[model samples]
Target: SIQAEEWYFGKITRRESERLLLNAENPRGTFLVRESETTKGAYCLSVSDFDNAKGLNVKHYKIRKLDSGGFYITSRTQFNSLQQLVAYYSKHADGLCHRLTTVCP
Candidate 1:
C-alpha cells in the first residue's frame, strides 16, 4: 500500500474490488494519468505502469495543456452512485473559473 499522495484517488467500484488511480504529475512536462486493475490489488499509480493499470477508469477529463506540453486537467469525471464528488469538483472549479457546463454528468 502506497501513500495517498502517491495516488490521485481510490475507490471500490460495483464490479471491481479496492483500486487506486494515479495522477502522474511532476515538475516535468509529463502528466500521464493511469489506473490499476482490480486483480492487481491495491497499489500506487506512480510506480505502476500502464500494463499493471487495467480495469481502471480514466473518466472523461478536460486537459489544459501548457505551452511546454505539460498541463493540468480541468476535471476528471467518474461514475458513482452519489455523484456528489463530481458535482463538488465542478463547483469548485467553476467557482475559481467560470465553465460552460449544463450537466454534471
Candidate 2:
C-alpha cells in the first residue's frame, strides 16, 4: 500500500529556501526548528523497492524528483483511518524550503 507522496509547488534555489524559512509562521514553520541549528537535514534521492522484508505484508512507497536540497521529512506514522493519517501528517509534514542566510547579531 502507498501511504503518501509529495511534490513541491516548483523547483527552488537555496536563497529562495532561506527566505521562506525566515518568514515562516506557526505550524507551517515548525519544520524550521532543526535547520535553525544545523545544516545537515535529510534529502531523498531515488525510489527503490529495496525492502528486504524477506516476506511480509507491508506498505510500499517511494519519493519522486527528490531533489538535492532542503527537502525533508519526519518519521512514518500509522493511524486508525485515512482521515486520521492525513491529519497527523498535515500537522507534522516537514518539507518547506528554509532561508539559511542572515546573521543573528
Candidate 3:
C-alpha cells in the first residue's frame, strides 16, 4: 500500500519516497536532502502528524534546480514529499498552491 499510496507523485527515487512516507507516519523529526553545487539541490523539513510538540504540522524548505545553476521553491505550501510538491508546481503554470492542478491555475 505504501508504494501505491506514493504513486500520485509520478516517478521518484526510492530513497526520498521512502523518507516521505516515513515522515507522514511519524513526522516528528528532521528530514534533509542535499546534492552539490553542480546539482545544487536540497530540501529540509520538520514534520508531525498534527500541530503537536512542533506547534506546526510541518516546517520546511524547498528548492529546485534550474538551467542557470539555481533553485526555486515553485510552491507555497508544505508537502510531505518534494515529489508531491514539485508535481504541484509542474502541473500549475500559475503561482497558486492548489493541489488539484486542474480546474485551477
Candidate 4:
C-alpha cells in the first residue's frame, strides 16, 4: 500500500505540510514527502529544523527525477528508489539541513 511508505504524504500543500511537521514532538530533522505544487512525478521533501538565529523553521529538498527512473536531491548521489534516497540521507545530511532523523508521524 502507498500508505506504508512512512513519510510519503501525497498531495499536501507546503502550508499544510508546515502544520504537519511544525510540532514540539517532531525533533530536529523530522520530515515528510508531499506532491509538488506544480510538478508531476516530482516531490517536496520538507523537514523542520531549529536554528539559534532563525528559530524553528522548515527546510525543503524537493526532488527531481533521473533518466533511469531513479531519484535524486543532488547530482552527487542518486538512488534507484525513493526509499533508497531517504535511507541514504538518514545517515548523512549530504546536501540537506541535517540527516532525516524521523519521519513525520
Candidate 5:
C-alpha cells in the first residue's frame, strides 16, 4: 500500500503571507506561478525548478513571491499576476502552503 503524510498551517491572509515571505530569514521556499488547467481564466502556483541550473537554462523569469507560503511568480499580465492570486485566495480560504519536511523509506 502507498502511504502519505499531510500537514497544514493555520490559514492566513494574502497580505500576511506577503509580509512574512518578504522579511528576512524567509522560511517559505519557492513556487512557479502558471495558468490553471482546471479553471479557465485562473492562475495558480506550482513547484519550480529553481535550484537546478539546467531547469533555469531552459527559461528564465523575473519571478516574484507572495507570502502565501513561498511562491515565485512571473510578471506575465495575461494571468493577472501574483497579486490577483493572493487576492482570490485571501477571500476564498484557499491560501495554503505545502512542503515535504522529511521522508522515511
Candidate 6:
C-alpha cells in the first residue's frame, strides 16, 4: 500500500513537500508521493530538480488513475501500484524532469 511506503507523504501540502525535497547531498530528482487535499483521491508526484535557466526548483506532476486499476503520469505507460510506478521512474526519467534519484524521507 502507498501509506506503508516511506516515500509516500500522504496528505502533506505542496509547500511542505517542497521543503523536504531540498538540502543535503544532491537532492536533484528526489521525490515523494502525496495525496491532494484539494481533490480527494487524487495524487501528485513532487521532485527536486534543476533547470538551466530556473536553477534549482521543485517540480510537481499530477498522477492520474487509469480506468483498470492502474496509475500513470502519461497514458502511454501505467503501473498497477505506486511502488511499480516509482520504481519505473527511478531508473528512467522518461518524461519527468529527471530520473527519480532518491526518495524524500
Give the winner by lDDT.
6
Instruction: List candidate 6 stretches off by more than 4 Å.
Output: 24-26
Greater TM-score among 1 and 6 belongs to 6
RMSD of each: 15.6, 16.5, 14.6, 1.6, 14.7, 1.6
Quote each prediction's TM-score: 0.19, 0.24, 0.25, 0.90, 0.24, 0.89
- Among these predictions, the greatest TM-score belongs to 4
For residues 1-105, what per-residue lDDT tens digits would candidate 1 score against the true structure? 212322234442422321222333211111122234443432211211232345223332332334433333333433231233333443444322222222211
lDDT of 3 by residue, 1-101 (tens): 11243223333443443456344444333232333223234532212224544342433334554444433555334455545554555455343222222
Which regions of candidate 3 deviate over 4 angstroms? 1-29, 34-49, 52-62, 74-105
Q: Backbone clashes per model, in order?
A: 0, 5, 2, 0, 2, 0
27 Cα displacement, candidate 4 (Å): 1.1
What lDDT tens digits, residue by residue, belong to model 2 across residues 1-105?
A: 212323221233444444443332322212211112223322221111112352111111222212332122333334443234334444542332221122111
Deviation in angstroms for 80 in model 6? Answer: 1.0
Question: What's the residue-level lDDT of 93 in candidate 3?
Answer: 34
Candidate 4 lDDT tens digits, 27-46:
88999988889987788899
* Candidate 2 global TM-score: 0.24
Q: What is the model-wide C-alpha lDDT for candidate 4?
A: 0.84
Better structure of 2 and 6 per lDDT: 6
Report the lDDT tens digits of candidate 6 across residue range 1-105.
Answer: 789998899889999997887655546898899987686667999999976797778889988886679998898899999899999999988889999988876
Q: Residues 1-105, candidate 5: write the lDDT tens digits.
A: 001211111233334333433433323333334344444433334322223333321121223444443333433322244444434433432223333111111
Segments in model 1 whose C-alpha atoms lie over 4 Å from true places: 1-5, 8-58, 74-105
How well does candidate 6 score on lDDT at residue 24? 55
Q: List the residue pairs that clash in candidate 6.
A: none
